Symmetry: D3
Subunit: 156 residues, 6 copies
């Protein structure tokens, strides 16, 4: 009766699409850990990204956020878990991710569960949101309230 | 601490690919129910299919098998659950299934978790196994031992 | 004057279809919605029923009209002095079978096909899936036009 | 020494199919076109007719022969002392369904499958789409082998 | 009255691109080819050069004009009193990445995108692949617009 | 005599690559494995190292030889009196970027490309993913040829 999953990504910044995945993971596993990737060139620092996710998931009691580095399967196994949950928008997303999933299962016995993203956000990604905002487009309805204002300031 | 998922399909007959999904589901949820579809023209009767799955999952203590009919989301919700787990082989599998997943979430709040099939069975399906066996090809390594002998008798 | 044909079986018309109609009507001087009469496979609604449901939902599009069609689509298109088809695409897989036919239509009759990307909210709906779910009791009121939902429940009973 | 089988129902053979035959014949010492018949569902054309259309279009390929068969393709191939199959592909879609059979065929009989990207001009023309379009009067005269076109119109009338 | 913008970097324009321009020009009263420049990364050709190659290949399309721009495409489109974009697609792959931008563009500015399946003969020739192949001496003389080919060889040498 | 070229960077060669080599060597009279020298992007192993690893793993294929290549692939192929390329495909997405290049190669030089479906067991392996996983400590001994694994661990240290 002690199930759990890791939700990995760069989350730079977290989108409503990502939040939806976290909420859906947290509804089906006893414990969910969001793993924010540290990579040796982002718009937000790892601490900022972690902050934004915490503010948006405060209503999820069984969820926590941490930074991670190195092999994802090492992160997962060091926390006593062996499941990863990720959202997918399209069939080519699946193709990219299936390779990694099968590799992760092979080298460390860690399984991967995919969820279809909510339809209203089939077209949102952190990068497209950032690009559009940079050139003055309105992305307020695609980012959580926590994120949107902080994104404004970053470009200002 | 009471999580659970439904694994649906026709399973006519169950393959090593399907068994792999069941095992992977049973490792990550407290309760797993395999739902064998009843449809008003199969090679195996629903009771036969149920039998074959039970024989192959006897080492999975938190798994049970039932027949189901009608809307899948009704089956799931009547058992107090709200998650479906299905395997995917390819990106077009994803496309087909994403539609159904989003519809199921919309009409009944039931979520769907997909897993990538084990690589060794990327090409197995119940139908191709049956077709090849019908024309005399050897499909013994693709079906569980329970199924293979029973499939022989069915064509004999 | 410019123009396009929006073909389909529309049995029944979905909110996704309506989105396509509106986008076409916004960009072409005239739009004809062509409702396929399939003499082999009949569906849930008669073609007259399908036409009235579409007309109800497109009452505010003065440059769009609705007609039944039969047989080769590119003949229907050409006979009306047009040579463009507008269709929705929900995903990459829609693009695939649709692509072959688009190529065929261009080659056999010089008729162009324009695809538009479905609105995200209704991307998973299809006439077939809406009917299947409704038949077995599911709630599809948010996925179907007002012109359709109540009529749909009636045919099921 | 080397050899490949090019299988299909070829009902009728298309320009795409012929492209594949030519490319296979260029790269293997011998090529057998296998016309695979379903003994249960008669197609548009009889086996004799399918073979004659293919032979008429491949008269310039001296290392190619045409034979019919049924049942497991890998048995047809191995009975000829071969163990390669050559087929065309147009899309990622095609590759996905063909990959399954190719992997199965390798698994059960050790038979390899080589895929080739078909020439783009006529790749979209499948046997079924051509028949469908021709059935409803579409002009497919430029889209099919000369050995096929009028024979196809003859059947339809 | 009606109008569409056909956007791209066109570095260089391809036969595929030109197919799209022609089809857009056939179905809309006016068409603007938008040559969108990255003010940070200079391509192979300058803006003047990109425009000249396009104009040379579209001299027979009287309702088409060519203009450069930068930044958000939807701003370029709306500043011209338009709200449609026309682009080509070759694969389900293309449609998937373009669907994202199309949906974003509809969301932020109400601008529609119409996709057309490009003519199959030359669909595989992208600007980048042509440049790559030409850079290493591959014969691309039959695969590119006459306004482009020797200009491209000139740049590479 | 028949023949084909199996091109790649093979940095390092995988069990998937070896499967392709073996299948090619079984069906063509001669096979040349062409190891790309990329003067811009250097990799983990030198080309001489890559060649010796492949030679070790193909020691029992007498009709296969291994050579370095640079520049346009179809020149390498033609210069050796061949006009066929054999490559592996793992999925529908591999088919997509590979398809464009296959078309290009056929058009600019008349060189055919044959694709073979990867064996299922190793479908998720790629040189890049194997290196990435190995760098960060993961266990890839079952995914790589004997000629490679120990040498790989050496370069990482
Ligand atoms: O898993 C890998 O292949 C990998 C290997 C090297 C570096 C990154 C990763 C990686 O995939 C990864 C992605 C996200 C996160 Cl959150 C983490 N993490 O924190 O451990 C890792
Ligand atoms: O869910 C649907 O859309 C549906 C509607 C009508 C009939 C079948 C289904 C269906 O998808 C389904 C599939 C498998 C199983 Cl195991 C069940 N089931 O037992 O409930 C249903
Ligand atoms: O074009 C075809 O291939 C075809 C040939 C026979 C019958 C149907 C069609 C066809 O695709 C088609 C589809 C929708 C409509 Cl709405 C019409 N129509 O009204 O003419 C035709
Ligand atoms: O063909 C190209 O497009 C190309 C042009 C420049 C440089 C590389 C290539 C290329 O694709 C290629 C790839 C692998 C090998 Cl192994 C070779 N080769 O050895 O000649 C070439």
């Amino acid at each position: 009766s002690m199930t759990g999953a890791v939700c990995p990504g760069s989350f730079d910044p977290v989108t409503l699409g990502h939040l939806d995945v976290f909420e859906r993971a947290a509804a089906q596993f006893d414990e969910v850990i969001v793993a924010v990737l540290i990579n040796p060139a982002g718009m937000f620092t790892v601490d900022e990204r972690i902050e934004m996710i915490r503010e948006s998931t405060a209503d999820l009691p069984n969820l926590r956020v941490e930074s991670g580095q190195g092999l994802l399967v090492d992160f997962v196994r060091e926390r006593g878990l062996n499941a990863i949950v990720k959202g997918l928008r399209t069939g080519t997303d699946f193709e990219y991710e299936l390779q990694m999933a099968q590799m992760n299962k092979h080298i460390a016995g860690v399984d991967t569960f995919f969820v279809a993203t909510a339809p209203a956000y089939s077209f949102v990604s952190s990068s497209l949101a950032k690009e559009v905002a940079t050139y003055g487009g309105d992305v307020s309805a695609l980012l959580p309230a926590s994120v949107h204002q902080r994104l404004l300031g970053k470009l200002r």
